[PDB]
Amino acid sequence: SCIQFTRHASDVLLNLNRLRSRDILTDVVIVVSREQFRAHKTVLMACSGLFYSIFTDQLKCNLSVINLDPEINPEGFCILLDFMYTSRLNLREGNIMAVMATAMYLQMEHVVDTCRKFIKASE
Amino acid sequence: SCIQFTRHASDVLLNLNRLRSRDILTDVVIVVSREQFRAHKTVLMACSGLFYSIFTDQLKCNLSVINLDPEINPEGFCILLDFMYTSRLNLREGNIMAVMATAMYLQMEHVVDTCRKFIKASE
Amino acid sequence: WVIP
Amino acid sequence: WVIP
Ligand SMILES: N#Cc1cnn2c(Nc3ccc4c(c3)CC(=O)N4)cc(Cl)nc12
Numbered sequence: 001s002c003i004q005f006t007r008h009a010s011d012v013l014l015n016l017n018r019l020r021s022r023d024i025l026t027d028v029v030i031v032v033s034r035e036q037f038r039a040h041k042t043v044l045m046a047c048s049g050l051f052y053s054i055f056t057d058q059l060k061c062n063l064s065v066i067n068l069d070p071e072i073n074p075e076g077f078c079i080l081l082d083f084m085y086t087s088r089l090n091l092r093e094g095n096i097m098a099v100m101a102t103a104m105y106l107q108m109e110h111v112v113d114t115c116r117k118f119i120k121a122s123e
Numbered sequence: 124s125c126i127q128f129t130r131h132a133s134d135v136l137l138n139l140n141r142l143r144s145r146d147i148l149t150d151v152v153i154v155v156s157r158e159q160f161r162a163h164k165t166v167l168m169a170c171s172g173l174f175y176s177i178f179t180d181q182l183k184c185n186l187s188v189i190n191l192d193p194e195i196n197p198e199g200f201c202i203l204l205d206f207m208y209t210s211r212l213n214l215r216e217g218n219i220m221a222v223m224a225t226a227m228y229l230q231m232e233h234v235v236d237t238c239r240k241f242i243k244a245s246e
Numbered sequence: 247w248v249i250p
Numbered sequence: 251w252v253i254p
């Protein structure tokens with residue numbers, strides 16, 4: 001018999017992105033080649049099958065630094081990290097291949113789906 | 124020029140509630156009289172003006188235990204904590220006064236609003 | 247607020 | 251997915 005506040009989930013995510021921008025309570029640095037991205041492990045796990053697996057691991061759960069595969073593109077990661085915290089995906093002709101490869105590695109199925117559909121439409 | 128995934132914010136919140144249920148990466152215990160509630164500081168701050176103030180404080184940000192005012196009702200807190208993690212508010216005739224008082228203390232304006240409207244309709 |  |  002609950003009532004539901006429609007905008008609550010979006011409002012929570014907006015405040016999680018504000019915490020990220022201010023570097024408040026971030027507990028991990030994701031290293032992608034020469035670039036570093038600070039984030040909250042809980043948000044990463046909530047968005048990515050890869051981070052969900054990493055941070056449920058009894059040893060990796062305590063690491064403050066995670067190094068991604070050297071084939072991962074930093075811009076592609078940046079675009080996906082922004083997506084995690086905002087629901088908005090900056091998908092462009094110039095970055096779609098890198099975004100799709102990063103989304104496959106991060107196990108972000110909905111992003112992979114749409115990248116596949118946008119690529120299929122251009123061929 | 125971003126695209127947006129409509130269900131993303133709700134999916135994130137669902138996974139944050141799963142982490143709470145499994146006690147994964149919880150970093151605070153909220154003590155309400157004889158009861159204890161484990162939570163994620165980032166979610167508490169994102170939902171509550173009171174927790175936002177508490178956890179941006181340079182000393183309180185590092186506490187693992189927060190004790191609420193002894194006038195706060197544990198059930199009212201439990202209902203609001205569930206709301207924070209789900210967008211669903213279990214508002215009933217028997218708990219509305221406790222929920223509204225707890226929402227005022229926690230500075231959860233949208234919950235206070237609706238409690239006020241539900242009370243006004245019954246008088 | 248809505249009835250979900 | 252939508253145009254926001
Ligand atoms: N507890 C917990 C918890 C935290 N996070 N999380 C999940 N995170 C996840 C796992 C796989 C995938 C995605 C997110 C997006 C995607 O495409 N695949 C799942 C579950 Cl079943 N549980 C949890």
Ligand SMILES: N#Cc1cnn2c(Nc3ccc4c(c3)CC(=O)N4)cc(Cl)nc12
Pocket residue numbers: 015016018019020022024168169170171172173175230231232233
């Ligand atoms: N950074 C950050 C950040 C984390 N959380 N958070 C806010 N949390 C908040 C503050 C006040 C109120 C509510 C939530 C619900 C309500 O009724 N009042 C606000 C801002 Cl402006 N910023 C942040």
Ligand SMILES: [Cl-]
Pocket residue numbers: 047108109110111112
């Ligand atoms: Cl996704």
Ligand SMILES: [Cl-]
Pocket residue numbers: 170231232233234235
């Ligand atoms: Cl609220």
